[PDB]
Amino acid sequence: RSELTIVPDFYPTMVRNFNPYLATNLRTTTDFIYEPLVVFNEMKGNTPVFRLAESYKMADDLMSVTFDIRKGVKWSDGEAFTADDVVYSFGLLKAKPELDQRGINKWVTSVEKVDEYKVRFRLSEANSNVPYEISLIPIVAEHVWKDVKDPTTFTNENPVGTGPFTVIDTFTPQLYIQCRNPNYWDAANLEVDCLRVPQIANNDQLLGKIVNSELDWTSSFVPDIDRTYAAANPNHHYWYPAAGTQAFMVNFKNPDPAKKEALDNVDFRRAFSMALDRQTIIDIAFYGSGTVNDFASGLGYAFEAWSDEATHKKYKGFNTYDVEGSKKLLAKAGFKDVNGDGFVETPSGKSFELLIQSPNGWTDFNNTVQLAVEQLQEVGIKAKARTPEFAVYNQAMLEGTYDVAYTNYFHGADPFTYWNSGYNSALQSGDGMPRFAMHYFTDKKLDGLLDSFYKTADKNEQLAIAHGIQKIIAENQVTIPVMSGAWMYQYNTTRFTGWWSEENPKGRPSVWAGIPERLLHVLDLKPV
């Protein structure tokens, strides 16, 4: 019996709840207990990997999509998994929207049974991203939940699932073990017998147990990881691939004529960007946990699959640490120190200072701004750090009164989330809008491409649209991308091999609930 010790989440004690539709439950329910129809491998162009369903096909009118259920799969119950399950699950969520945590009801008007192994989702809007959203919705057993009178309080203590681990072998306040689904449709590929889940309340307890080498799969913050964890045992490894993008946003419509002259000048934005030492910002402010983002478009290395490598290389130098190139471009653009103070004045000769915003209390971001100032000062740019409370820091962006601001962004399964929220002009106005697109740069074509990204299910066409967005953003150096956050993930080779890593980058390695790829990951694990 091979047991794999995982820590998808911390708890003060173990409470037996495997209801996939409750916000508060056990983090080993989705993906291990209830297998999705498809798990999309986001790190790899968001390519779908077929599980419970064999295939899906959107109509050319993109208002509906059908999935073909794989024949022969069973519930740990012994019962057959069919379209009836899919239809029932979505109906349950449609009828009781509070069970719909992802808000799928927004997209799916109804789910109909085409036949025992084929289901059709009807949509309320043309959107080729719906199959992806559908993949994230857990499917339960109709023959079981139909008799569940209260799905909103049901704790599902003796789960009947389609996933690899459905048997609750041990359950106590300090530990639970979830073992192999005896009817698992893909048992041949499952070599781990059980999931050993130890109760760990916080980072302190995890650190102590992880350095002792008693864990296999974790996704927790580990302080001074090279010293504490890595050097304690040669089987101690970790891999932190790229995540969400972080950057300095410049205000194109700065109300101060002098500042605008600088910010609303592509060459100045490029100079500003060449002065930054990205790797140092990651090593100092973020303790080495992050990835350099030298994409002018901010695409980042989490989506290198979508990148037009030519557009990347063409502007990559404007987003690389280059002190002398910076001083030179500024010189060429007219930004000269006429005053004699050591700081560059606008080309029309006006003096200026740039206030760089970061929310009060966000230490890593505050330190980043402080480093940016020191670095900007080396190229003649006068900048000063400021740390207003988030509300003010946010209002200043929505009102367009700020100069420069460091910020992170949401991170999607593909570049869309970043590019749309961060650059779509329609988001720069209206009541209740976030700060993400508030740089006030506008371009009718760019918007056109963003609004068409999901208006085609033709991958290569979509891919072309991606390249089109990338070129517009990069050539205008709209913002100054700095880094990509890190996906937390540590693995131990003492008991298993096959782990994903920098050397074997099959996908997002985290063990967290919310990372569907974890199912494919556990399947690559082989005991020692």
From TrEMBL:
- Indicate whether Metal-binding appears among the record's keywords: yes
What range(s) does the Solute-binding protein family domain occupy? 48-423
Q: Which GO terms describe its biological process?
A: dipeptide transport
Q: Which cysteines are joined by disulfide bonds?
A: C179-C194
The record lists the membrane-crossing segments as none
SUPFAM superfamilies, alphabetized? Periplasmic binding protein-like II
Name the family: Belongs to the bacterial solute-binding protein 5 family.
**PANTHER family, per database record:** D,D-DIPEPTIDE-BINDING PERIPLASMIC PROTEIN DDPA-RELATED (PTHR30290:SF38), PERIPLASMIC BINDING COMPONENT OF ABC TRANSPORTER (PTHR30290)
The protein in question is named Peptide ABC transporter, periplasmic peptide-binding protein
